RNA sequence: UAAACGAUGUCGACUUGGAGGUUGUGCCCUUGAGGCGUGGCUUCCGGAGCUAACGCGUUAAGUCGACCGCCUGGGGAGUACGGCCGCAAGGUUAAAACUCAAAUGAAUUGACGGGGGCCCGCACAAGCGGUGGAGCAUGUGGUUUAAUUCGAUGCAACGCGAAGAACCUUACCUGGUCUUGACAUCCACGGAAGUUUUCAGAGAUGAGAAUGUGCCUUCGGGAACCGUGAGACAGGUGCUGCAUGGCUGUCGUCAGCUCGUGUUGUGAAAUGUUGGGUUAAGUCCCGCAACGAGCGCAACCCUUAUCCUUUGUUGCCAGCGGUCCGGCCGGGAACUCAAAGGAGACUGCCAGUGAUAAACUGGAGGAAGGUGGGGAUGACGUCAAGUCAUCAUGGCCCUUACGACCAGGGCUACACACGUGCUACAAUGGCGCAUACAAAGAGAAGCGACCUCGCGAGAGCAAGCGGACCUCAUAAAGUGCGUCGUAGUCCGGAUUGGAGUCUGCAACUCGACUCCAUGAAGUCGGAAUCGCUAGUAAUCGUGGAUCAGAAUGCCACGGUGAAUACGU
């Protein structure tokens, strides 16, 4: 489906910030719709990281948000023959949002005395490659990096393509010929 | 938008009526199809199948198609000068020379088709498919096997047809 | 047979209606029932002639009827007694002092309901209904209008089973929401049971009805551009 | 639908006027707070036995022009079905379709 | 035996060719299974002619020839029966009673492939939240009684007809009570209706008191309300939705459908209305029998956004006065501000993408860019789809009633399951204290400042009101600080005791709101499953429709306001 490609919209800034990495961090921290609390939840977390080390307030945040963060994803496709998979490369925008989502689900159940302590400790824990979504990033990227050896209904697609102009190689495809 | 042929006389022989269905794709619409025969009094190859929303608009469409891409054709006296067996598409019909003392002898819509054709005294049995849509080709194929009079002596009869172009 | 709601969800958004009055609050109900009654009883009294639109109107201190006909002065009677009687009953039902004026609509000699009268007769007498709807549309398009839709239903031709049939011609848009366009639903019985025609007729897409007002009401006709406004 | 509830309502407005008019706040005057040390006694607590049908609390109305089983609308004197029906034919004034 | 065949008997003569496979042989640069010359079988392609269609066409299914084989509706039967051959099962030509109106060659379009391939909706995805689990709200069924009334059954039933349900309502059930009858006209009798007021009975209804005897007139007599009675006649959630009318839901925003007409085929019918690329689009580049035009879609349309523009109150206030510094008022017009003319933005530009191209995406100034934001907005029409119960209505039944007055009971029971939605399970939150800003709208039997009463809701009285004037209204979440650790808590607060309130003689089961004390279910719920692209989704309060009395919903508003849209 879809008659056209449609991109992201403009997202507005918040009354305490003009930086984007802050405004996008408060946004997917938003629950009950109320960002004006989440403003504080981000800035109270960042001060606690900053007491743990004073070189930066960003110490544990920047590498947690790299380390629990994927690069590739796998879809499953088959309309005949045998079961196959097709890996895709995805956008930074969704790599980032899986990672931040997983940080805020894991930290809110972490059960410490302030949401500020809970997030600084869960970024401190994933920064060192031993937190709760290191496993989730590692399994998901393994499966997408591995299924690059398969393609939608390969056995008829290999004859079908070379008859209707195409290659004699072995390649992944978006639910068509290969 | 085309040339048409006319007769100085009216023919409105409606032979068949039908309805068009697609049954799910837009469901079923009220449209009809129709077949109507336009002679001349001595004959035409005039046969028209057309279609529209309602029966009147449908027949008038079909009556129009019975007089475009068609021409009139002609035969002297109420008989045919050849005993020939006209066939058109499994509907096969017969003729043999006759008197004026007999006129039509036929039923249904066929007696009305033969009267304009000039082959009503010679009217002999039809065989194969004799339902309305194809039975009515008397005045088409039965006037393409045609013979018609032009001689004064039977022994000049083949000589007279040769000199008609030589 | 989905039958999209053919005119109700299309009004008041530069599309005039068959009433123009103001009411609000809890008494809107007492004014509407009274307006139905005067619509029902008044057109029955002037039924001597055929009639093309009906407009009943309630401005400050008065009740004003506009009526539209295929010929003018015809429901107004002779002398002036006939029309004082029309004003007697308009006051009696609404309960306010009464006015009526006579006026005609765009394309007056044609109207939605006079097509359905023409189609009904053949059916009432149980003969000649197979070309009748088509001849009605032909006459109708010879007397005016830029497009017409006719839909007939009934135990049609006097049949012992029901039939839907319709006939459409020219330019009759169906998502249209600008200019008044004329509609009638007939209902009637004869020996075999009920018949009916739904008659949509389409005059114009900016021809007929009101137009959108081309100014504010705020600068115009104001001989003194202040009360004070701080400027004195 | 169904005339018997419409028949009940038509009788009721003359019966509102007859029983209930003289006995509106009489409940309150003779029994409740208006009976502040006056009344509250048996020799006056027999006076209101006629009104029971006449009461505004049984004055449900429904559709004022045909009758309808529930779903009445007080501003038109009409109902869901009958409003839409009158609007198709343009009989209702001031009537927009919502767009803003 | 058989699908045991140039599917086409045998063999032959004649009828525009070209070329493929592959081969005698003349000729070639032997220039690639080739060409030309002249034969070959064997196959593609198509003309004269032929077919019902596929198809045939110089190897005929053409034009024919001689001479032989064979058929006479189907099923039952290539069997039986007869003659004959066969170790032996068998083979061989080839039939009827009986059954039956068909059986059978071909092809159109829908549907459909699990044959090949193409496309779309927030339908998924990319996520986010919700129902289903708790409890409550409310509808459905199950199950129950005098009866717990139906209509409807994924998408096309279940916050929907049937939006405010004590009786009324209202179908249901039972009890009183009458038949022109709640209601119209027409005749007959008793009471005027209206109002105040005691009482009997359940209330219907009636008696008595006190006020009034109006209305028109032959004061015959009747209308008005109520009782009484008779016809004509009124009335009928009366049946039948294959007897119907009006009306509407579906596919679907499918991306197509239809109206007039020509053409190709013997025609059914197609074509257009189908392909590629592009789209909200029959929009637009390319193009075949489609041509012209309409529908869906685009448009006018109301609305927003800045911004121009005018009014200047029941709206506003930069400076200025009265002054507690409040537009309340002297006064002012810079200003929002309300409702309206509208301006601006056109996929128009530039660049990428795209088949040149529509158009999509990016780019930029700007309040704002994806046909600016929002809404309007949905074709012909099969579906025997659903309503005779708004309403219309025949055939056709009751009319001491399938009407009608009056009271009481019930849908809302409770066993649970099921649709939908509400608010919780947390801490993005709750609590405590302190602290903030709305939009919109409803109020002429009404609500309503002050008033006195009130734990609060509210109460009766009333200035006032017409709602930008007055009041609902302390708007809440949110904000400030401190606090809380998965422990049913610092979340949730159902039940229940018990008090206070509303419309009304009358709140017990069936109704709604306030408030005091205690206190359970519920740790984000399985199968199942949907809505959503941005003022949306989520979440908190508000008002309104409805509305005798009252909301958890709906409907619309405003607070605080998100992830992403690769891909089919």
């Amino acid at each position: 489906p879809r008659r056209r490609v449609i991109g992201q919209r403009k997202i507005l800034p918040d009354p305490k910030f003009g930086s984007e990495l802050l405004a996008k961090f408060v946004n997917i921290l938003m629950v009950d719709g109320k960002k004006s609390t989440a403003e504080s939840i981000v800035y109270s977390a960042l001060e606690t990281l900053a007491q743990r080390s004073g070189k930066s307030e960003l110490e544990a945040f920047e590498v947690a948000l790299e380390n629990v963060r994927p690069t590739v994803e796998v879809k499953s496709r088959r309309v005949g023959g045998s079961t196959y998979q097709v890996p895709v490369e995805v956008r930074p925008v969704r790599r980032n949002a899986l990672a931040m989502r997983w940080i805020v689900e894991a930290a809110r159940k972490r059960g410490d005395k302030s949401m500020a302590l809970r997030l600084a400790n869960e970024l401190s824990d994933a920064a060192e490659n031993k937190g709760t979504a290191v496993k989730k990033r590692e399994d998901v990227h393994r499966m997408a990096e591995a299924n690059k050896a398969f393609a939608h209904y390969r056995w008829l697609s290999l004859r079908s393509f070379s008859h209707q102009a195409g290659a004699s190689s072995k390649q992944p495809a978006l639910g068509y010929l290969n | 938008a085309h040339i048409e042929k006319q007769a100085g006389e009216l023919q409105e022989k409606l032979i068949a009526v039908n309805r068009v269905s697609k049954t799910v794709k837009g469901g079923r619409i009220f449209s009809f199809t129709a077949l109507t025969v336009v002679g001349d009094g001595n004959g035409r190859v005039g046969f028209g199948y057309g279609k529209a929303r309602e029966v009147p608009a449908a027949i008038q469409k079909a009556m129009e198609k019975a007089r475009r891409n068609m021409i009139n054709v002609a035969l002297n006296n109420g008989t045919l000068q050849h005993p020939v067996k006209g066939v058109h598409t499994g509907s096969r019909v017969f003729m043999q020379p006759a008197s004026e003392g007999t006129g039509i002898i036929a039923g249904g819509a066929m007696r009305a088709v033969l009267e304009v054709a000039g082959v009503h005294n010679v009217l002999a049995k039809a065989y194969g498919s004799t339902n309305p849509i194809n039975v009515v080709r008397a005045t088409i194929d039965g006037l393409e096997n045609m013979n018609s009079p032009e001689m004064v002596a039977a022994k000049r009869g083949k000589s007279v047809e040769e000199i008609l172009g030589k | 047979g989905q039958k999209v709601h053919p005119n109700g969800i299309r009004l008041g958004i530069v599309k005039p209606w068959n009433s123009t009055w103001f009411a609000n609050t809890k008494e809107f109900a007492d004014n509407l029932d009274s307006d139905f009654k005067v619509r029902q009883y008044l057109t029955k009294e002037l039924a001597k002639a055929s009639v093309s639109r009906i407009v009943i109107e309630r401005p400050a201190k008065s009740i004003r009827v506009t009526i539209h006909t295929a010929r003018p002065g015809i429901v107004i009677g002779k002398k002036g007694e006939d029309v004082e009687k029309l004003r007697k009953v308009v006051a009696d039902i609404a309960g306010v002092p009464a006015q009526i004026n006579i006026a005609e609509v765009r394309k007056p000699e044609l109207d939605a309901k006079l097509v359905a009268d023409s189609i009904t007769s053949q059916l009432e007498r149980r003969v000649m209904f197979r070309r009748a709807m088509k001849r009605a549309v032909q006459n109708a398009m010879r007397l005016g209008a830029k497009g017409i839709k006719v839909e007939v239903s009934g135990r049609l031709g006097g049949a012992e089973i029901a039939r839907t049939e319709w006939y459409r011609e020219g330019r009759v848009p169906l998502h249209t929401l600008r200019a008044d366009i004329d509609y009638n639903t007939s209902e009637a019985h004869t020996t075999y049971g009920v018949i009916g025609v739904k008659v949509w007729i389409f005059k114009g897409e900016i021809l007929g009805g009101m137009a959108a007002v081309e100014q504010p009401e705020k600068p115009a006709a104001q001989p003194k551009k202040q009360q004070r406004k701080g400027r004195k | 639908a169904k005339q018997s509830m419409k028949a009940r309502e038509v009788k009721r407005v003359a019966l509102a006027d007859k029983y209930f008019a003289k006995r509106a706040e009489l409940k309150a005057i003779i029994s409740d707070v208006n009976a502040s040390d006056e009344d509250r006694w048996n020799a006056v607590l027999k006076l209101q036995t006629l009104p029971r049908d006449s009461s505004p609390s049984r004055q449900r109305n429904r559709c004022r022009q045909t009758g309808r089983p529930h779903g009445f609308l007080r501003k038109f004197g009409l109902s869901r079905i009958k409003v839409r029906e009158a609007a198709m034919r343009g009989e209702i004034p001031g009537l927009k379709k919502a767009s803003w």
Side-chain angles (χ1 to χ4, degrees), chain C residues 1 3 174-175 183 225 230 232:
Chain C
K3 191 184 291 189
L174 297 192
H175 75 298
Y183 179 74
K225 297 313 313 181
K232 56 179 190 182

mmCIF file of all heavy atoms in Angstrom, chain C residues 1 3 174-175 183 225 230 232, chain E residues 245 247 249 296 312-313 332-333:
data_model
loop_
_atom_site.group_PDB
_atom_site.id
_atom_site.type_symbol
_atom_site.label_atom_id
_atom_site.label_comp_id
_atom_site.label_asym_id
_atom_site.label_seq_id
_atom_site.Cartn_x
_atom_site.Cartn_y
_atom_site.Cartn_z
ATOM 1 N N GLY C 1 -27.363 -0.333 -1.873
ATOM 2 C CA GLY C 1 -28.421 0.674 -1.800
ATOM 3 C C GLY C 1 -28.281 1.618 -0.627
ATOM 4 O O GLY C 1 -29.124 1.659 0.241
ATOM 5 N N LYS C 3 -27.830 4.973 -0.059
ATOM 6 C CA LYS C 3 -28.716 6.153 -0.046
ATOM 7 C C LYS C 3 -28.094 7.122 0.913
ATOM 8 O O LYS C 3 -28.542 7.251 2.065
ATOM 9 C CB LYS C 3 -30.155 5.700 0.208
ATOM 10 C CG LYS C 3 -31.180 6.895 -0.061
ATOM 11 C CD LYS C 3 -32.671 6.503 0.277
ATOM 12 C CE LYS C 3 -33.151 5.483 -0.720
ATOM 13 N NZ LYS C 3 -34.553 5.234 -0.618
ATOM 14 N N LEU C 174 -23.375 15.310 -5.913
ATOM 15 C CA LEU C 174 -24.019 14.679 -4.778
ATOM 16 C C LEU C 174 -23.307 15.043 -3.477
ATOM 17 O O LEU C 174 -23.970 14.945 -2.453
ATOM 18 C CB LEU C 174 -24.073 13.106 -4.956
ATOM 19 C CG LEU C 174 -24.919 12.645 -6.162
ATOM 20 C CD1 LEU C 174 -25.081 11.097 -5.953
ATOM 21 C CD2 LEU C 174 -26.332 13.214 -6.242
ATOM 22 N N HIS C 175 -22.069 15.554 -3.427
ATOM 23 C CA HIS C 175 -21.330 16.080 -2.252
ATOM 24 C C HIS C 175 -21.474 17.588 -2.139
ATOM 25 O O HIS C 175 -21.137 18.183 -1.142
ATOM 26 C CB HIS C 175 -19.894 15.650 -2.154
ATOM 27 C CG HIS C 175 -18.917 16.289 -3.088
ATOM 28 N ND1 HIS C 175 -18.943 16.215 -4.493
ATOM 29 C CD2 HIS C 175 -17.888 17.134 -2.744
ATOM 30 C CE1 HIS C 175 -17.891 16.907 -4.925
ATOM 31 N NE2 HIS C 175 -17.202 17.468 -3.941
ATOM 32 N N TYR C 183 -35.795 19.488 -3.993
ATOM 33 C CA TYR C 183 -36.030 18.061 -3.691
ATOM 34 C C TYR C 183 -37.420 17.780 -3.239
ATOM 35 O O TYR C 183 -38.041 18.543 -2.431
ATOM 36 C CB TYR C 183 -35.085 17.776 -2.520
ATOM 37 C CG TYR C 183 -35.133 16.375 -1.964
ATOM 38 C CD1 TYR C 183 -34.543 15.310 -2.690
ATOM 39 C CD2 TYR C 183 -35.801 16.018 -0.801
ATOM 40 C CE1 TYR C 183 -34.562 13.959 -2.314
ATOM 41 C CE2 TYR C 183 -35.805 14.701 -0.358
ATOM 42 C CZ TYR C 183 -35.282 13.640 -1.125
ATOM 43 O OH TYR C 183 -35.277 12.389 -0.547
ATOM 44 N N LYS C 225 -18.471 57.282 13.347
ATOM 45 C CA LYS C 225 -17.444 56.204 13.528
ATOM 46 C C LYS C 225 -17.006 56.167 15.008
ATOM 47 O O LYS C 225 -16.003 55.525 15.282
ATOM 48 C CB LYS C 225 -16.216 56.532 12.639
ATOM 49 C CG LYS C 225 -16.458 56.561 11.108
ATOM 50 C CD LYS C 225 -17.225 55.402 10.500
ATOM 51 C CE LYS C 225 -16.646 54.032 11.034
ATOM 52 N NZ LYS C 225 -17.345 52.884 10.446
ATOM 53 N N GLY C 230 -12.146 56.913 23.415
ATOM 54 C CA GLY C 230 -11.032 57.737 23.827
ATOM 55 C C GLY C 230 -10.618 58.919 22.926
ATOM 56 O O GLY C 230 -9.760 59.670 23.401
ATOM 57 N N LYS C 232 -12.330 61.628 22.005
ATOM 58 C CA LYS C 232 -12.881 62.871 22.564
ATOM 59 C C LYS C 232 -13.077 62.726 24.040
ATOM 60 O O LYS C 232 -13.461 61.627 24.521
ATOM 61 C CB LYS C 232 -14.221 63.305 21.950
ATOM 62 C CG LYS C 232 -15.295 62.231 22.049
ATOM 63 C CD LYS C 232 -16.537 62.790 21.435
ATOM 64 C CE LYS C 232 -17.665 61.775 21.772
ATOM 65 N NZ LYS C 232 -18.915 62.196 21.181
ATOM 66 P P G E 245 -40.756 -0.764 -1.995
ATOM 67 O OP1 G E 245 -40.158 -0.424 -3.333
ATOM 68 O OP2 G E 245 -39.854 -1.101 -0.870
ATOM 69 O "O5'" G E 245 -41.657 0.478 -1.499
ATOM 70 C "C5'" G E 245 -42.212 1.352 -2.446
ATOM 71 C "C4'" G E 245 -42.682 2.610 -1.738
ATOM 72 O "O4'" G E 245 -43.663 2.391 -0.718
ATOM 73 C "C3'" G E 245 -41.559 3.477 -1.153
ATOM 74 O "O3'" G E 245 -40.872 4.187 -2.156
ATOM 75 C "C2'" G E 245 -42.479 4.325 -0.299
ATOM 76 O "O2'" G E 245 -43.263 5.194 -1.120
ATOM 77 C "C1'" G E 245 -43.422 3.277 0.339
ATOM 78 N N9 G E 245 -42.808 2.500 1.464
ATOM 79 C C8 G E 245 -42.384 1.160 1.611
ATOM 80 N N7 G E 245 -42.083 0.804 2.811
ATOM 81 C C5 G E 245 -42.162 2.017 3.519
ATOM 82 C C6 G E 245 -41.933 2.134 4.995
ATOM 83 O O6 G E 245 -41.483 1.289 5.785
ATOM 84 N N1 G E 245 -42.203 3.428 5.408
ATOM 85 C C2 G E 245 -42.672 4.419 4.528
ATOM 86 N N2 G E 245 -42.861 5.636 5.012
ATOM 87 N N3 G E 245 -42.916 4.245 3.189
ATOM 88 C C4 G E 245 -42.683 2.981 2.758
ATOM 89 P P C E 247 -36.443 8.589 0.608
ATOM 90 O OP1 C E 247 -35.808 9.915 0.286
ATOM 91 O OP2 C E 247 -36.429 7.458 -0.359
ATOM 92 O "O5'" C E 247 -35.895 8.038 2.014
ATOM 93 C "C5'" C E 247 -35.813 8.828 3.213
ATOM 94 C "C4'" C E 247 -35.442 8.044 4.460
ATOM 95 O "O4'" C E 247 -36.072 6.843 4.433
ATOM 96 C "C3'" C E 247 -33.970 7.698 4.313
ATOM 97 O "O3'" C E 247 -33.120 8.766 4.771
ATOM 98 C "C2'" C E 247 -33.913 6.466 5.191
ATOM 99 O "O2'" C E 247 -33.848 6.879 6.523
ATOM 100 C "C1'" C E 247 -35.284 5.832 5.034
ATOM 101 N N1 C E 247 -35.224 4.534 4.327
ATOM 102 C C2 C E 247 -34.909 3.330 4.956
ATOM 103 O O2 C E 247 -34.638 3.351 6.166
ATOM 104 N N3 C E 247 -34.922 2.077 4.288
ATOM 105 C C4 C E 247 -35.342 2.122 2.988
ATOM 106 N N4 C E 247 -35.595 0.969 2.312
ATOM 107 C C5 C E 247 -35.647 3.368 2.342
ATOM 108 C C6 C E 247 -35.526 4.555 2.957
ATOM 109 P P G E 249 -25.750 5.593 6.186
ATOM 110 O OP1 G E 249 -24.901 6.479 7.026
ATOM 111 O OP2 G E 249 -25.705 5.752 4.714
ATOM 112 O "O5'" G E 249 -25.490 4.032 6.532
ATOM 113 C "C5'" G E 249 -25.185 3.657 7.937
ATOM 114 C "C4'" G E 249 -24.978 2.157 8.045
ATOM 115 O "O4'" G E 249 -26.078 1.383 7.613
ATOM 116 C "C3'" G E 249 -23.856 1.789 7.106
ATOM 117 O "O3'" G E 249 -22.572 2.099 7.585
ATOM 118 C "C2'" G E 249 -24.124 0.334 6.778
ATOM 119 O "O2'" G E 249 -23.602 -0.523 7.808
ATOM 120 C "C1'" G E 249 -25.698 0.272 6.812
ATOM 121 N N9 G E 249 -26.254 0.405 5.490
ATOM 122 C C8 G E 249 -26.725 1.516 4.768
ATOM 123 N N7 G E 249 -27.174 1.235 3.593
ATOM 124 C C5 G E 249 -26.817 -0.070 3.403
ATOM 125 C C6 G E 249 -26.925 -0.866 2.225
ATOM 126 O O6 G E 249 -27.341 -0.519 1.142
ATOM 127 N N1 G E 249 -26.656 -2.239 2.471
ATOM 128 C C2 G E 249 -26.239 -2.741 3.704
ATOM 129 N N2 G E 249 -26.199 -4.053 3.850
ATOM 130 N N3 G E 249 -26.050 -1.936 4.749
ATOM 131 C C4 G E 249 -26.270 -0.578 4.581
ATOM 132 P P G E 296 -19.940 13.851 -6.798
ATOM 133 O OP1 G E 296 -20.680 14.260 -5.579
ATOM 134 O OP2 G E 296 -19.175 14.870 -7.557
ATOM 135 O "O5'" G E 296 -18.942 12.631 -6.474
ATOM 136 C "C5'" G E 296 -19.415 11.512 -5.647
ATOM 137 C "C4'" G E 296 -18.306 10.429 -5.505
ATOM 138 O "O4'" G E 296 -18.134 9.709 -6.729
ATOM 139 C "C3'" G E 296 -16.902 10.825 -5.057
ATOM 140 O "O3'" G E 296 -16.832 11.053 -3.617
ATOM 141 C "C2'" G E 296 -16.128 9.628 -5.558
ATOM 142 O "O2'" G E 296 -16.396 8.398 -4.834
ATOM 143 C "C1'" G E 296 -16.758 9.446 -6.886
ATOM 144 N N9 G E 296 -16.153 10.286 -7.943
ATOM 145 C C8 G E 296 -16.693 11.282 -8.694
ATOM 146 N N7 G E 296 -15.860 11.839 -9.537
ATOM 147 C C5 G E 296 -14.606 11.253 -9.313
ATOM 148 C C6 G E 296 -13.359 11.394 -9.996
ATOM 149 O O6 G E 296 -13.146 12.145 -10.938
ATOM 150 N N1 G E 296 -12.427 10.463 -9.493
ATOM 151 C C2 G E 296 -12.698 9.442 -8.575
ATOM 152 N N2 G E 296 -11.896 8.383 -8.619
ATOM 153 N N3 G E 296 -13.887 9.376 -7.945
ATOM 154 C C4 G E 296 -14.786 10.291 -8.310
ATOM 155 P P G E 312 -18.049 52.428 17.021
ATOM 156 O OP1 G E 312 -19.328 53.077 17.333
ATOM 157 O OP2 G E 312 -16.974 53.190 16.386
ATOM 158 O "O5'" G E 312 -17.477 51.816 18.465
ATOM 159 C "C5'" G E 312 -18.327 51.077 19.312
ATOM 160 C "C4'" G E 312 -17.470 50.441 20.444
ATOM 161 O "O4'" G E 312 -16.428 49.677 19.854
ATOM 162 C "C3'" G E 312 -16.889 51.485 21.346
ATOM 163 O "O3'" G E 312 -17.115 51.057 22.717
ATOM 164 C "C2'" G E 312 -15.480 51.514 21.018
ATOM 165 O "O2'" G E 312 -14.641 51.912 22.099
ATOM 166 C "C1'" G E 312 -15.273 50.064 20.587
ATOM 167 N N9 G E 312 -14.066 49.674 19.834
ATOM 168 C C8 G E 312 -13.232 50.452 19.038
ATOM 169 N N7 G E 312 -12.164 49.832 18.699
ATOM 170 C C5 G E 312 -12.328 48.571 19.207
ATOM 171 C C6 G E 312 -11.557 47.348 19.057
ATOM 172 O O6 G E 312 -10.556 47.072 18.365
ATOM 173 N N1 G E 312 -11.951 46.287 19.811
ATOM 174 C C2 G E 312 -13.059 46.354 20.591
ATOM 175 N N2 G E 312 -13.390 45.241 21.259
ATOM 176 N N3 G E 312 -13.831 47.450 20.735
ATOM 177 C C4 G E 312 -13.440 48.491 19.946
ATOM 178 P P U E 313 -18.220 51.760 23.622
ATOM 179 O OP1 U E 313 -19.240 52.542 22.880
ATOM 180 O OP2 U E 313 -17.565 52.442 24.743
ATOM 181 O "O5'" U E 313 -19.031 50.536 24.267
ATOM 182 C "C5'" U E 313 -20.417 50.306 24.054
ATOM 183 C "C4'" U E 313 -20.775 48.922 24.589
ATOM 184 O "O4'" U E 313 -20.234 47.882 23.733
ATOM 185 C "C3'" U E 313 -20.367 48.681 26.014
ATOM 186 O "O3'" U E 313 -21.397 48.170 26.803
ATOM 187 C "C2'" U E 313 -19.240 47.666 25.783
ATOM 188 O "O2'" U E 313 -19.016 46.793 26.852
ATOM 189 C "C1'" U E 313 -19.645 46.890 24.538
ATOM 190 N N1 U E 313 -18.561 46.183 23.879
ATOM 191 C C2 U E 313 -18.605 44.793 23.963
ATOM 192 O O2 U E 313 -19.401 44.134 24.562
ATOM 193 N N3 U E 313 -17.595 44.106 23.248
ATOM 194 C C4 U E 313 -16.702 44.673 22.410
ATOM 195 O O4 U E 313 -15.915 43.949 21.847
ATOM 196 C C5 U E 313 -16.533 46.129 22.640
ATOM 197 C C6 U E 313 -17.474 46.837 23.353
ATOM 198 P P G E 332 -10.348 61.190 26.521
ATOM 199 O OP1 G E 332 -10.038 62.419 25.784
ATOM 200 O OP2 G E 332 -11.595 60.536 26.247
ATOM 201 O "O5'" G E 332 -9.239 60.075 26.273
ATOM 202 C "C5'" G E 332 -7.837 60.238 26.431
ATOM 203 C "C4'" G E 332 -6.973 58.999 26.155
ATOM 204 O "O4'" G E 332 -7.227 58.038 27.128
ATOM 205 C "C3'" G E 332 -7.083 58.276 24.751
ATOM 206 O "O3'" G E 332 -6.256 58.858 23.680
ATOM 207 C "C2'" G E 332 -6.445 56.949 25.211
ATOM 208 O "O2'" G E 332 -5.001 57.109 25.224
ATOM 209 C "C1'" G E 332 -7.057 56.711 26.623
ATOM 210 N N9 G E 332 -8.301 55.960 26.605
ATOM 211 C C8 G E 332 -9.551 56.557 26.666
ATOM 212 N N7 G E 332 -10.532 55.667 26.721
ATOM 213 C C5 G E 332 -9.873 54.387 26.647
ATOM 214 C C6 G E 332 -10.431 53.114 26.585
ATOM 215 O O6 G E 332 -11.647 52.899 26.700
ATOM 216 N N1 G E 332 -9.471 52.099 26.438
ATOM 217 C C2 G E 332 -8.130 52.378 26.490
ATOM 218 N N2 G E 332 -7.367 51.302 26.309
ATOM 219 N N3 G E 332 -7.604 53.590 26.457
ATOM 220 C C4 G E 332 -8.521 54.589 26.548
ATOM 221 P P A E 333 -6.418 58.374 22.139
ATOM 222 O OP1 A E 333 -5.212 58.953 21.488
ATOM 223 O OP2 A E 333 -7.742 58.673 21.595
ATOM 224 O "O5'" A E 333 -6.205 56.715 22.110
ATOM 225 C "C5'" A E 333 -4.928 56.036 22.029
ATOM 226 C "C4'" A E 333 -5.091 54.743 21.308
ATOM 227 O "O4'" A E 333 -5.903 53.798 22.025
ATOM 228 C "C3'" A E 333 -5.701 54.966 19.889
ATOM 229 O "O3'" A E 333 -5.035 54.028 19.094
ATOM 230 C "C2'" A E 333 -7.113 54.508 20.099
ATOM 231 O "O2'" A E 333 -7.768 53.913 18.967
ATOM 232 C "C1'" A E 333 -6.991 53.471 21.197
ATOM 233 N N9 A E 333 -8.202 53.344 22.071
ATOM 234 C C8 A E 333 -8.710 54.383 22.855
ATOM 235 N N7 A E 333 -9.766 54.029 23.523
ATOM 236 C C5 A E 333 -10.186 52.777 22.923
ATOM 237 C C6 A E 333 -11.286 51.907 23.041
ATOM 238 N N6 A E 333 -12.231 52.068 23.916
ATOM 239 N N1 A E 333 -11.358 50.783 22.319
ATOM 240 C C2 A E 333 -10.420 50.603 21.415
ATOM 241 N N3 A E 333 -9.314 51.313 21.218
ATOM 242 C C4 A E 333 -9.249 52.429 21.976
#
